[model samples]
Target: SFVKDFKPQALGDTNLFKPIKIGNNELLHRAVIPPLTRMRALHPGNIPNRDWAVEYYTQRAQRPGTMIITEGAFISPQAGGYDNAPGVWSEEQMVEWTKIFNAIHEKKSFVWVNLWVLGWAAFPDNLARDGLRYDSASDNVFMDAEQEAKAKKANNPQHSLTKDEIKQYIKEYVQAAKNSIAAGADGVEIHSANGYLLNQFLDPHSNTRTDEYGGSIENRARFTLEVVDALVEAIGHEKVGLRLSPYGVFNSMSGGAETGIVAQYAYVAGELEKRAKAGKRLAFVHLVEPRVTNPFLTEGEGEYEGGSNDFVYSIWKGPVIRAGNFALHPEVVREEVKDKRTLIGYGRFFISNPDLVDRLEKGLPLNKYDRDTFYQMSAHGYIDYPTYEEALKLGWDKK
Candidate 1:
């Protein structure tokens, strides 16, 4: 099943791992490499200074039609959260991203920069630090139970954002998109998914805004739609991707968007489709399912992964990429593809086995990922994994 020169495009031809049209682009395969966090930026700049990024992405590129969504990158300084998560806030940061993109293109693969903002999640400490309202956004307040609890535990102060501040955030999203395209990204996606800042606004639990940016479903979706539309405008609709976790619950023990699952997500997708035209395609909708803590769905819904994709998103006519526990079995992946779904992201699989689909098809053993080395490490977990052939040659089977 495996060959010295196995190309997915030439092998299956039009099967599960075959090429398919995603939005405005033509991909060679359907195996997507989702974004991952390694926190390996070198010193000073906090840019992608480590060599692991190149090696890791290059290895993943070995798979045909491979598109790697970058780890969450901060769009602005104030929007920054997490330690050494890599920021696109400066021109230099974008330059390094150019290098990363060039490496992937060199392998004939595509890379989409995942840009994000942490409105309230950026951690507000303003009144105590600078003598003003914490400053996340005055009009928007967080009412989500879990997020509020986490805030208290983290000793974070509440912020009050003004209209000017809100406008500044909108500009930052546009600037980040422009920077991504300028830096040679094949395209960029609005990270409106997950538990980050964008989700902070979209999740009614996290956002308690009463103005134009809050209140009703349309208002709650205002921030995400603004950011997505901005990216689409900067880089044609075909080149833009929107990642939304309709039931995406991560980070906090509460305050996940799952609080208003069905309606909130449906509203988001509806607004994006309305803004899009017949000829224009919204790259793809990345859906993150309910995590262990998601109270509204999944384990919380009293079902184990059954209600993963509610009818809301499943009914969405756009190209959908589901990333979460989908990394479980090859059979699971096949099921999703048999349904005509666009892409399947093999999160950690790509970390250890660059040619994951190839390995699965060939029935070869995969390399186990090292959790300890994932974050706060050099290259061990990042770029040190061996391929099947290398592993065998190194006497892996004997071990």
Candidate 2:
């Protein structure tokens, strides 16, 4: 049928072995280790530049050209939300992040830092102690009523950002991108998903404003477009990527307005695509698959629509990344990469098998990831996942 040429008899035909240019960098493979925040270490100021971070990234960089996007790095001190999370704002953070990027590059891998601004999700205590506060869109808040109350109790003065404040936030984003490049990163992926600042701007439920940044779908997309434009200017579009979650409702997001759910994301993708077609050439636009649904939903509450691949592909002409739970099913990765422009990202699987690409290439079974130590701030589960050979030996010995 139509997908015959796209179909592969073995995992090798999926084009997973070939080189692909993401922005200016040519990645060795199509598989990606997308950003997974493992809060491994915490300093006095919530600094996440622990030595384990370097080891964690280096472990996954063994495959040349494999993309390893570092976990979300705060654009500013107030951009943080959780304990021991990393940042890229200060000179100290920059030095540490530089070490991470250098370590990954030493392995001949393409690494990008996931730049993020948490807005109101910034843990209030950190900002309050310093008499600093950040603002969000008009209606943006943490998860729900209970969370909002908790935010207030913690002194999180969440409110709408003034027009000027939005400009400052955008500036912060551009600077973060620049710093990522300075830190030896090959690229940067703006963390606009999971109800972060940019995602909140796109979600009507979180953005109830009459300004240019809210109201209609196109309007709500203005801030994101601005950030995209600035990032392209700061770090060249070839090394810049944006991640979107159209179906994710995490962190109090409604995944766009009640209506035009797909259109909301389509508009953002189209605008970026248009820029790329005009010669900007963005690296990629990553859309989280529906398979990675809202974690807060009651069991069986959300339905999977197979992701917004069709809509996204229709609008985005550049490389598109389909992330989440696709690592184990090489068939799924095979079929998705049939387009040749599509790539697959593995989060959990990579955590278990640092040499994930080699294992996939060899058709070996993957080791299971330990969730109990996912964010336990210890190297026990952080860098202990053995390579394919070791895992195979253990399995054989047990038998």
Candidate 2 stretches greater than 4 Å from native: 1-10, 139-142, 295-303, 395-397
lDDT of 1 by residue, 70-160 (tens): 8778777666655567878787788788888888888888888888666555544422333223334333356355646655665665665
Name the 10 consecutive residues with the lowest summed lDDT in model 1.
1-10
Q: What value does the lDDT take at residue 24 in candidate 2?
A: 69
Query: Model 2: how far is 33 from its true place, Å?
Result: 0.7
Give a tens-digit lDDT track for model 2, residues 1-399.
011122223466558888898876788788888888788646665565566778888989998888888887888765666667887777878878777788888999888889878875666666666666745777444546655665577666676877888888888888888887887888889888988888878888888888788889988988888888998987787888999888887777775335577888888888887887789968898878776666434323564664455788887888888886676556667778878888888887788788888877876666766777877878888898888677666563255
**What does the lDDT come to for candidate 1?**
0.66
lDDT, each prediction: 0.66, 0.77
Best by lDDT: 2
Write down the lDDT that model 2 would get: 0.77
